[PDB]
Amino acid sequence: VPLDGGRFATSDLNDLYRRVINRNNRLKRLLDLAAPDIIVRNEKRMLQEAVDALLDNGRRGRAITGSNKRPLKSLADMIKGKQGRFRQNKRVDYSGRSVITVGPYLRLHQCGLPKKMALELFKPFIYGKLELRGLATTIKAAKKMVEREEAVVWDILDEVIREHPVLLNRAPTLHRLGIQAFEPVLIEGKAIQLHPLVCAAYNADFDGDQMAVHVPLTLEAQLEARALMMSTNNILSPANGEPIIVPS
């Protein structure tokens, strides 16, 4: 890919493939020019070290990169653990994060959610109403009504969030109680409020700890966030029958 400004940003494989096709291309020549067997016998010995620097580089002299001083990154150093797999053991859309605060007026099953965030996660839903209620003729004309923050969307956004459970989850998620759904309530500010009883499940002090929030999109995914994962179902920790919502 060409970077911005003229430089290119090549992967570290176009440095290794050029080194096999070059050496293999020469060894095609020495068998037509008929060199002695001190050289061509040194060619195959030199090619075979370049095919094996491609598969798994490092079990040899560690053919470090040119024009730089770190070792190249071969194919078998791409699946090899980064502590985990290359596939799914998945960064995720419809997310956010902010500084949690207290908000001790909430019920047990609801968490705050700032207007400036909820208007950004629930965007494709809001586009549905503004073209369903006829307020916007076409979708391009709805993208310019949400950018202005017209006073109509603040009343359409509230009906999109009628019973739509969101998923708060803290960073080092130890046990299954580290992820719980909540029914949002639109506040003003930029801190995700959170009922004080539940802050001992996440193990969250209120001194700067942030918390991602997700959004279950489909129709089976906001029932699993209400039957199984809701915050009023988990009052007994799974490790043992003792409660987990003790007033702290």
Binding site: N42, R45, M46, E49, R60, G61
Partner: peptide, 14 residues
């Protein structure tokens, strides 16, 4: 005499 040498440049000169 092959003292576990690996890199060819050792093997070329030798």
């Amino acid at each position: 005499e092959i003292g576990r040498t690996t890199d060819p440049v050792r093997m070329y000169m030798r």
